[PDB]
Every structure is written in structure tokens, then in C-alpha cells.
């Protein structure tokens, strides 16, 4: 009484409503540190003028 387990399972059946269906989620966070920038885009580099 008044002592519960903090977690609970999802009920994921293929017949569940889209609202209750499982969705995979990925969150991309970008970070500039006090360190070299090592993650870069595919943009081609050019010569310097």
C-alpha cells in the first residue's frame, strides 16, 4: 500500500491503435566543445585564395 514499482510495461500488439503502436525514436543533439570539431558534413572542400 502506497509502495509501487516505478516502471511498467508497454502493451505492444500488432492490432493496437496507431496511437498505442510502437514508435522508434532517435534524437540528434549537436555539440561544440572546448575541443576540436571532428564531426563534419559531406560538403566538398576547396583550395584557399
Amino acid at each position: 500500500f502506497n509502495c509501487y514499482f516505478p516502471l511498467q510495461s508497454y502493451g505492444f500488439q500488432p492490432t493496437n491503435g496507431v496511437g498505442y503502436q510502437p514508435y522508434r525514436v532517435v534524437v540528434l543533439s549537436f555539440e561544440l566543445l572546448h575541443a576540436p570539431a571532428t564531426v563534419c558534413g559531406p560538403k566538398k572542400s576547396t583550395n584557399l585564395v
Partner: nanobody
Amino acid sequence: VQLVESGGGLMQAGGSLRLSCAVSGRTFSTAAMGWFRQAPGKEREFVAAIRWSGGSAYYADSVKGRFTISRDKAKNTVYLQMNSLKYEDTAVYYCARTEYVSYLLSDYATWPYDYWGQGTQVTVSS
């Protein structure tokens, strides 16, 4: 996934028996284990449940103060220590397993379990 029960059998009233139920095969997770029993001509009836995480136990009224459910996570085994045996305890005892995590332990008394053992006879004599 298989539930393999052992122990039990014949014991005189007032005595104690221990049932074991070992889980074999690849499991992703275990939420809870339970013991049920079915006496001849009667409906299968909840006995006890234990949450795998933390080991909190829930008991049918009929076995409180007499039976203890316990778990060995490393051996993937649940136990029922059946003390102060009475004739009314004579039944086939079934191990059950679920991956369903309820916040509410008492739910394990009425939850339909996913996996069942073959059943082990306990017979209490005079």
C-alpha cells in the same frame, strides 16, 4: 523457453516440502514468477507471485504464514517453501512466468501468465 518443476510429492500433514521451477532457454527479461495449483475437479487457483526485480512477494490468503516464495536470479529458479502442510494443499502445482511488468504487485494474482510448467503433484497424508 521451458519451465522445469521439481520437488514435492508425498508428505504427512504438518510437514514441509520445497518446490523448484528452473527457467531454461534464451529470455529477454523476466518480470515475475508465480505458483498456481489445481486440486482434482477444482479450478486452477493462484498461490504466490514474486517480482524478479527486488523480490517482493504476493500470496493467496489460504497460504499466508505457511508458504514462502523466493527467487535465485543467477540460477533463474523460483521456489515455493510449503510449510505446515494441510490436506487442502493436495494438488498439482504449476510454475508460471511473465515478462509483463505491472507497477502493482497484486496484479500478479490475476494476470494471465505467458509460460507454464508441466505441473508437480503434492499429496498431503494423515
